[PDB]
Coordinates of C-alpha atoms in Angstrom, one line a residue:
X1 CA 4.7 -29.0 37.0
X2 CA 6.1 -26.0 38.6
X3 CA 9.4 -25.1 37.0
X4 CA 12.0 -24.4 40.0
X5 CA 14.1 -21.1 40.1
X6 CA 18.2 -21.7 40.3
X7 CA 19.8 -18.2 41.3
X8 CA 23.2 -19.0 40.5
X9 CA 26.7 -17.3 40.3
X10 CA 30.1 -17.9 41.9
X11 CA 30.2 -16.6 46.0
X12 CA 30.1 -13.4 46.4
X13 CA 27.6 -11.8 43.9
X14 CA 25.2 -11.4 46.5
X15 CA 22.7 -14.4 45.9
X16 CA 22.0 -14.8 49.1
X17 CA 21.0 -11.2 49.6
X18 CA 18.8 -11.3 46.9
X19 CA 17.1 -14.3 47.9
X20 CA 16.2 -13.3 51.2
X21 CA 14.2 -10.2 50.0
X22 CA 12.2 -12.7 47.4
X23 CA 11.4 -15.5 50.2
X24 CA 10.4 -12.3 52.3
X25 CA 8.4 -11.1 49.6
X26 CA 6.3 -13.8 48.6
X27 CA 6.7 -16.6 51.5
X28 CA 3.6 -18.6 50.5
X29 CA 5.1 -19.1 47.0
X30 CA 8.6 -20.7 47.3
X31 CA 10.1 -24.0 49.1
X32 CA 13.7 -23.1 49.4
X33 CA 16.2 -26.2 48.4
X34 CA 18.4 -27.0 51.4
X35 CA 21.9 -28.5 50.8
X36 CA 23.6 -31.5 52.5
X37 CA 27.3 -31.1 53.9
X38 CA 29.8 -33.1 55.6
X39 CA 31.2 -30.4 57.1
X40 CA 30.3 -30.4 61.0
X41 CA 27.7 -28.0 62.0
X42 CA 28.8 -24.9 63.6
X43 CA 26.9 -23.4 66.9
X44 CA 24.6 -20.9 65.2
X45 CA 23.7 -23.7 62.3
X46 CA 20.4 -24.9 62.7
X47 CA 20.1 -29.5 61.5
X48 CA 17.1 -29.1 58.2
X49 CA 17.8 -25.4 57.3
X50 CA 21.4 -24.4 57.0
X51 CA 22.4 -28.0 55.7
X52 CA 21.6 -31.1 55.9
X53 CA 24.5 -32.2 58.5
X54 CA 25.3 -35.8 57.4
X55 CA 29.3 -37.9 57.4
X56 CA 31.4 -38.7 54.8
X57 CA 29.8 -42.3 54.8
X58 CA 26.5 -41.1 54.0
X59 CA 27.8 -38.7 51.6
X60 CA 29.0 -41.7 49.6
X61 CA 26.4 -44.3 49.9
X62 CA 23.9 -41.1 48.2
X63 CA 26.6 -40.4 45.5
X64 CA 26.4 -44.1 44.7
X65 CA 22.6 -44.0 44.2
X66 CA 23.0 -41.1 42.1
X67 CA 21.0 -39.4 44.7
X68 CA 22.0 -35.6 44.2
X69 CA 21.2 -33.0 41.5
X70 CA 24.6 -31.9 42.0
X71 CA 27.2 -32.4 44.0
X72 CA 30.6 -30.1 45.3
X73 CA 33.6 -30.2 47.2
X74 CA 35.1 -26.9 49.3
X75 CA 37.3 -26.4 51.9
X76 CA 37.6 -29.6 52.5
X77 CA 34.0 -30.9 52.8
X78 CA 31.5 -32.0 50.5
X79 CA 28.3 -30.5 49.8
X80 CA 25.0 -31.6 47.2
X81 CA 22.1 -31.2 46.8
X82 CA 19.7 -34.0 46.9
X83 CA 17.0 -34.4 44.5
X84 CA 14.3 -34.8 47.0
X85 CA 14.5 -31.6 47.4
X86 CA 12.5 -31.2 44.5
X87 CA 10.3 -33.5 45.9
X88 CA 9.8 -31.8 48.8
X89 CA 9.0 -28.5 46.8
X90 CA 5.7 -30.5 45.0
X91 CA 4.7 -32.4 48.1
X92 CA 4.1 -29.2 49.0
X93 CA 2.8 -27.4 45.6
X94 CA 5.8 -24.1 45.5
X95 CA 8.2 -23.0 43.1
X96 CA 11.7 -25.3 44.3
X97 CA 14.0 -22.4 44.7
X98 CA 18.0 -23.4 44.2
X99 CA 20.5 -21.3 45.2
X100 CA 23.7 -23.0 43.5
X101 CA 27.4 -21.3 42.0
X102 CA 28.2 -22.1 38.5
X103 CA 29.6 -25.6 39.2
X104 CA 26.4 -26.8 40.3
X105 CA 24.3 -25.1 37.6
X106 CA 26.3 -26.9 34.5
X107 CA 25.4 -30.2 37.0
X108 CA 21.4 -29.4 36.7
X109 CA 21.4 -28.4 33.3
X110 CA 22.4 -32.3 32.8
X111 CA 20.0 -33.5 35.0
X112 CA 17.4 -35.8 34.0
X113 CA 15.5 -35.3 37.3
X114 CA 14.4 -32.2 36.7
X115 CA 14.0 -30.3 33.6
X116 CA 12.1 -27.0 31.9
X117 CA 14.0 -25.0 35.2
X118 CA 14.6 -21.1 35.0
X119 CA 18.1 -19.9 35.4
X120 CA 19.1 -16.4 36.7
X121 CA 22.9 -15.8 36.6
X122 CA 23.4 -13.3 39.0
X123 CA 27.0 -11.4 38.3
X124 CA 29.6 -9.6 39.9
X125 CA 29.9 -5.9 38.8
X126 CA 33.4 -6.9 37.7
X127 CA 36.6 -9.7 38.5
X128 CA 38.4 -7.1 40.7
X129 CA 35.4 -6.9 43.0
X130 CA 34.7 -10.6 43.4
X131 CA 37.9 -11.1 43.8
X132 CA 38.5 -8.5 46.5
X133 CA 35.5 -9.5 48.9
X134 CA 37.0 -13.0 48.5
X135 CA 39.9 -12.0 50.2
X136 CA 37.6 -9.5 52.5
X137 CA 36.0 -12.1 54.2
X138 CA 38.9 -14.7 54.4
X139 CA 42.3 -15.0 56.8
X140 CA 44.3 -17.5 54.7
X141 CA 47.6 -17.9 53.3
X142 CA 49.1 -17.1 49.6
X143 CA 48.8 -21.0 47.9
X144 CA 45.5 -21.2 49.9
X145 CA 44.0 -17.8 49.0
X146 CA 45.3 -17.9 45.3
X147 CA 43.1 -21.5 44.6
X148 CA 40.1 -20.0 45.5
X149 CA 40.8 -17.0 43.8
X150 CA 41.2 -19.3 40.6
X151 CA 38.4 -21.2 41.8
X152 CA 36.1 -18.1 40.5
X153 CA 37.6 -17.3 37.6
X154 CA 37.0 -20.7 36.5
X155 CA 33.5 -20.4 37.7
X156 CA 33.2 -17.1 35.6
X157 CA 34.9 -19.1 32.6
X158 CA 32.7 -21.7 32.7
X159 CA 29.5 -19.0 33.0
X160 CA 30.4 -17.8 29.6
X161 CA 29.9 -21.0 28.0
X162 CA 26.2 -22.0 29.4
X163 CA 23.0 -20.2 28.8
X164 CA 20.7 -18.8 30.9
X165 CA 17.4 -17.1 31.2
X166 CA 18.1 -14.0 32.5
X167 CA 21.7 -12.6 33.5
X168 CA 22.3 -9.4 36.0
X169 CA 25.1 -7.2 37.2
X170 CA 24.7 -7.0 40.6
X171 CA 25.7 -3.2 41.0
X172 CA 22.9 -1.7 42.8
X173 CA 20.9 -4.5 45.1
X174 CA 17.9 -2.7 44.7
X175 CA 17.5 -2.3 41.1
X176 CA 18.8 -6.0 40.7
X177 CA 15.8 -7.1 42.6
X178 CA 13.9 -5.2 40.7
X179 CA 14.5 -6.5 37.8
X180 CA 14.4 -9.8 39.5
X181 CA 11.0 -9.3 41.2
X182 CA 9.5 -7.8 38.0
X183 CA 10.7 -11.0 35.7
X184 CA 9.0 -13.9 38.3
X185 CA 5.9 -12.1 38.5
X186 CA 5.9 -12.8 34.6
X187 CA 6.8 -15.9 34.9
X188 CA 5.0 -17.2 38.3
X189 CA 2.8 -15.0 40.3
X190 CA 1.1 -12.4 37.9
X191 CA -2.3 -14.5 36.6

């Protein structure tokens, strides 16, 4: 059994960056989990890879067969991951590679579906900046603006109290991967 990889932190930290270079890097060894939302599917989105597109119905029937690993709610829409996913990710013999925020992490640490999984808490190099490119990258009003903004300082709250396997301040993207590359080839590819 292939342990899977969860790169976790609250928005902003630059998971995504980072995850983009390892999938680059070693294609053939990684089967990237892909989330469901019922949030409608913009024009670039792409049905299988950006989200699983599904309704509010469907959504529900899922949560009530305990079907996701975790499960979220933003902006009003609500997203999870299922665990076939996982499935998915043996089927096809590769490392199941989550990308979640702290909310979701505390969720798979409790799962019984999967278990022995690797966590890498990828940080901010400090509040104010996490804080900052929230605001950066949104257009919204003061109540609006100041939930989200307590949103991740409850996700950094709630970081302090879980463990993980490996924890990085995101300073310098290319000494973080680094550091991240370096740490999976000891514990996937290397031998």
């Amino acid at each position: 059994n292939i342990y899977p990889l969860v790169i976790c932190g609250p928005s902003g930290v630059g998971k995504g960056t980072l995850i983009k270079k390892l999938l680059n890097e070693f294609p053939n060894y990684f089967y990237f989990s892909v989330s469901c939302t019922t949030r409608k599917k913009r024009e670039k989105e792409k049905e299988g890879v950006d989200y699983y597109f599904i309704d509010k119905t469907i959504f529900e029937d899922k949560l009530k067969n305990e079907d996701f690993l975790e499960y979220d709610n933003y902006a009003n829409n609500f997203y999870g991951t299922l665990k076939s996913e996982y499935d998915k990710a043996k089927e096809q013999n590769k490392i199941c590679l989550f990308e979640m925020n702290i909310n979701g992490v505390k969720q798979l640490k409790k799962s019984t579906h999967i278990k022995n999984a690797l966590y890498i808490f990828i940080k901010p190099p400090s509040t104010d900046v996490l804080l900052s490119r929230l605001l950066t990258r949104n257009t919204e009003n003061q109540e609006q603006i100041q939930k989200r903004m307590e949103q991740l300082n409850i996700e950094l709250h709630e970081a302090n109290l879980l463990n993980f396997n490996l924890s990085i301040i995101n300073d310098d993207l290319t000494l973080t991967y680094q550091q991240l590359k370096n740490y999976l080839l000891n514990s996937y590819i290397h031998l």
